[PDB]
Design a protein around this ligand. Structure first.
Ligand SMILES: Nc1ncnc2c1ncn2[C@@H]1O[C@H](COP(=O)(O)OP(=O)(O)OP(O)(O)=S)[C@@H](O)[C@H]1O
Lengths: 244, 66
């Protein structure tokens, strides 16, 4: 089974390959925003990994835009490979996940796993019906509640995110995930500065503001307050903090 | 299924993009600014001065009564 990891690493976007290529990608009709050259390379690696029937971990550093990488991989898969339709989420980030799906790839049907018991049963019924949705987004709480009920529908791909910060995750849940019928699986890890030459510039400034005469008068009044001199020298933390 | 795909994908386009808020959208379209809807002021008298090198004024009456 280690051969899968070996092949994935062979194609993994290492630092040199993470930027050093010019794959003349065309935008799948679903995708709209322009990725980076390095995010484009991650897209190519994901497409090859799925094409070769492999499961891999996203070794990119934290904070580089994994959401858009998965979204672009979904777009390329759906367009080139034609698998026109799962994501596991923890909390509010369910809203962020679907929002970014709609944002970069507005052409995909989205199914949300939020609702009442009656609404959740209706969602299940629609979820088993043909051509009902393309991407299903669910909460980890729902997955644990429906650990076995999720076994009924077969999936082209599955994504796991935020699990590392989710309470109650257990090896049995990983076994269930493997049991889930996703022909390919993807795992997102924040700990598998990076790729900064094309990230946002983040220009930061601090400018010096000379105190007004009124401010200086009040400042020296508060300093010269004999109580404040006594507190300053004594070092009593509460008093000096009040002065500060 | 590429024809069927084009069909429901354009439908999905309409549905999803109608959810966003004129921002959040990567293709940030230009100059929406949603102007006022006017909304009634009953019968009105419009005073309109325009440049034509020269300046002209047009006074519009909404209805024949006024
Ligand atoms: N120039 C850019 N620099 C960084 N990110 C960009 C840039 N252009 C587009 N993006 C992506 O646009 C998206 C907007 O941010 P969000 O998606 O809300 O945050 P996020 O990257 O999804 O947070 P994560 O992946 O859960 S840690 C991200 O996926 C970014 O990676």
């Amino acid at each position: 089974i280690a051969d899968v990891t070996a092949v994935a690493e062979a194609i993994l976007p290492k630092g040199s390959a993470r930027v050093t290529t010019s794959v003349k990608f065309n935008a799948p009709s679903l995708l709209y925003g322009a990725l980076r050259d390095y995010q484009k390379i991650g897209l190519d690696w994901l497409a090859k990994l799925y094409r070769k029937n492999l499961n891999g971990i996203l070794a990119d550093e934290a904070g580089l835009g994994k959401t858009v990488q998965i979204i672009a991989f979904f777009a390329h898969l759906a367009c080139n490979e034609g698998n026109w339709g799962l994501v596991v989420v923890r909390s509010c980030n369910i809203l962020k996940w679907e929002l970014e799906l709609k944002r970069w790839c507005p052409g995909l049907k989205i199914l949300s796993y939020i609702g009442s018991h009656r609404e959740l049963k209706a969602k299940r019924q629609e979820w088993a019906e043909p051509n009902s949705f393309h991407v299903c987004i669910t909460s980890y709480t729902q997955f644990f509640r429906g650990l076995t009920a999720f076994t009924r529908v077969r999936w082209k791909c599955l994504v796991i995110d935020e699990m590392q910060r989710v309470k109650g995750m257990t090896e049995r849940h990983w076994e269930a995930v493997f049991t889930l019928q996703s022909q390919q699986r993807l795992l997102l890890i924040d700990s598998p500065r990076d790729v900064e030459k094309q990230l946002t510039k983040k220009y930061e400034h601090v400018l010096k503001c000379r105190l007004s005469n009124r401010q200086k008068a009040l400042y020296e009044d508060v300093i010269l307050q004999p109580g404040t001199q006594e507190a300053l020298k004594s070092g009593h933390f509460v008093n000096v903090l009040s002065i500060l | 299924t590429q024809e069927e795909l084009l069909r429901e994908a354009k439908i999905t386009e309409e549905l999803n993009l109608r959810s966003l808020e004129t921002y959040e959208r990567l293709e940030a379209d230009k100059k929406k600014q949603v102007h006022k809807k006017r909304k009634c002021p009953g019968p009105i008298i419009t005073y309109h001065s325009v440049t034509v090198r020269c300046s002209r004024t047009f006074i519009t009456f909404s209805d024949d009564a006024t």
